[PDB]
Design a protein around this ligand. Structure first.
Ligand SMILES: [Cl-]
Ligand code: NA
Lengths: 361, 361
């Protein structure tokens, strides 16, 4: 059985270092807000090319905390791609802001920048761009809109660790950026973990307070905060793995290229990489998606859908269910993710392509 | 230097097991919502005598999720002790409920049950009791009150793991209970961690979904949830230490009873317990508090204040600053915690007692 994402294969590379660092932390007696956190933050900040990184508890927390720190009014509006993972939307509604859902470009699976300005109102306060599946979104027009309309740009970078746009990295393309390090993400922890990146000194400081009980100083709560922290342990495991992230992303680039050069089936629409793509998910598109997933499972190849029900169609967002978002809807009906990971074996990726080429519907 | 809480000493007893279990989890390649979480939940449920235990990310989240799951209306009231740690109140306000702050009894530091009914209104939906410092609240009148008025009882158990009121454990004295397993708590993880305990089936299922993005099934989101999970690693660590928690609590009792029996100083009010007490914190009370903390520091003993500023006097809750809560206020001016731990050395507790006895002010 070929797994969609074999985390034991990904992480076995680092077992001895993981165990050493675990023993070190034991020796230290310090498990929360310690030297591993500081060191990982400083390294990931350098990696993204930003001044400040704040470790927090997970990627949803990361986005929720960014939005919280801005102190928007209830029902203030945040423009966001309609086809992102529901956690992007959860972060907006958690803060009692209104998600304003915008269709993706079929050629990027990212928000179509050309469709944003028409949905801007007096209540719009922010654009949340999502670098979906690993590809950076085209920022040129979004930055111009944010300047014109006094909007914040919030990046959800959970699927695109390390992706590059012009001279910069995802994480450094707007005002503040949220990352997940959920274990299955391009840089994965061994438990829940996240961070926030920004260049703004005051914002950074506010976010640190907000994620630590709203406290700058022992005893004292300046803000109504959260408990959203990155464990020393997880910070340590992340910093070991961070030294290999660009290499890991390049290994995914090699697999994606093999898929793109070798899969030739009229029933399958392959993904493109207009801008830099770190290939968190390798997403194909077909009218016979359920049939493809079943066929692949018959051939011992596990595949997962990202995603089959769009946020506006979820039961939790009943008041959005009526929205007509046909591009987003069609994508959800037709997409399927092929296995891909940095450590994936050649014989496994060749088999995936060969089996897809044999699929004759 | 005598540190207030020496977590290395606490945890060193378990290092070999921690490492064994970590490797086990590495072998599993499964770090989130797995067998370790299940096992620990099952065992902590048994320990509390409840049907259900849901591991979550921390004790503040535990309380926040509980209130969220009840789906109270905006500005619905939750009665809560005024002198608790601010997390208890954050859980209430994050949910857009109004906290109704009640004075503690000066001789228990817990909510005075006799002061609750007069503050019940048509908007009251719940009573949050806190078992402060490790002492269980006198629950009988509170349970009758909540029945009389159809209120939920929410227990904040973060300081009182394993305490017993009559025939039941804390965690099994209300409708739902929150626990922290912050490393410094009586059962502490090696990272942020928490749980919810309840006997109610629907409530436990609703909580699991709410803590997993609002998802009860793959691809679907029934609620607008958040991400509050207990890592497999931390669940395994906790399960190791749980097996010693009763033994350790009894060891804390021995040391607190040493303090109570051996400290005798006219400037110091000892925390004589009215009900069962597992002595998370050993809190003394004096008119010369800052002086005492300095004296002790001069004799190389570290103390911490739990707490110096009450929630209503915090900058994050300026709308509450006006409230006249003199018992709570006095307590905050006068309390100081002495070092206590189940592993604490005899010479060390004897020195604390000795140095306090010699203290003339
Ligand atoms: Cl076949
Ligand atoms: Na965590």
């Amino acid at each position: 059985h070929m797994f969609f994402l074999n985390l034991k294969q990904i992480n076995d590379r680092f077992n001895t270092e993981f165990i050493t660092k675990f023993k070190e932390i034991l020796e230290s007696g310090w498990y929360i807000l310690g030297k591993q956190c500081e060191k990982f933050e400083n390294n990931f900040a350098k990696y993204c090319g930003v001044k400040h990184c704040i470790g927090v508890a997970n990627g949803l927390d990361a986005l929720r905390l960014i939005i919280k720190a801005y102190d928007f009014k209830e029902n203030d509006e945040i423009i966001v791609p309609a086809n992102t993972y529901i956690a992007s939307i959860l972060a907006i509604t958690d803060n009692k802001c209104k998600p304003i859902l915008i269709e993706p470009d079929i050629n990027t699976y990212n928000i179509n920048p050309d469709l944003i300005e028409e949905k801007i109102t007096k209540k719009t306060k922010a654009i949340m761009v999502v670098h979906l599946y690993g590809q950076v979104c085209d920022m040129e027009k979004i930055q111009l809109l944010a300047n014109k309309y006094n909007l914040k740009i919030i990046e959800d970078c959970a699927q695109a660790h390390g992706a590059i746009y012009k001279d910069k990295r995802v994480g450094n393309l707007g005002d503040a950026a949220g990352f997940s390090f959920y274990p299955g993400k391009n840089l994965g922890a061994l438990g829940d973990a996240g961070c926030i990146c920004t260049n703004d000194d005051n914002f950074a400081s506010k976010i640190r307070a907000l994620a630590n009980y709203g406290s700058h100083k022992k005893y004292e709560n300046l803000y109504t905060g959260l408990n959203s922290r990155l464990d020393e342990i997880q910070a340590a495991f992340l910093d070991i793995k961070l030294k290999y992230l660009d290499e890991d992303n390049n290994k995914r680039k090699n697999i994606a290229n093999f898929y793109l050069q070798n899969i030739k089936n009229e029933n399958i629409i392959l993904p493109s990489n207009k801008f830099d793509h770190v290939w968190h998910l390798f997403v194909v598109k077909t009218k016979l998606r359920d049939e493809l997933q079943h066929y692949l499972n018959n051939h011992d190849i596990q595949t997962i859908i990202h995603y089959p029900i769009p946020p506006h169609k979820q039961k939790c967002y009943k008041d959005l269910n009526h929205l007509k978002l046909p591009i987003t809807e069609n994508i959800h009906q037709e997409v399927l993710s092929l296995p891909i990971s940095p450590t994936m074996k050649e014989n496994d990726f060749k088999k995936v392509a060969d089996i897809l080429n044999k699929w004759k519907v």
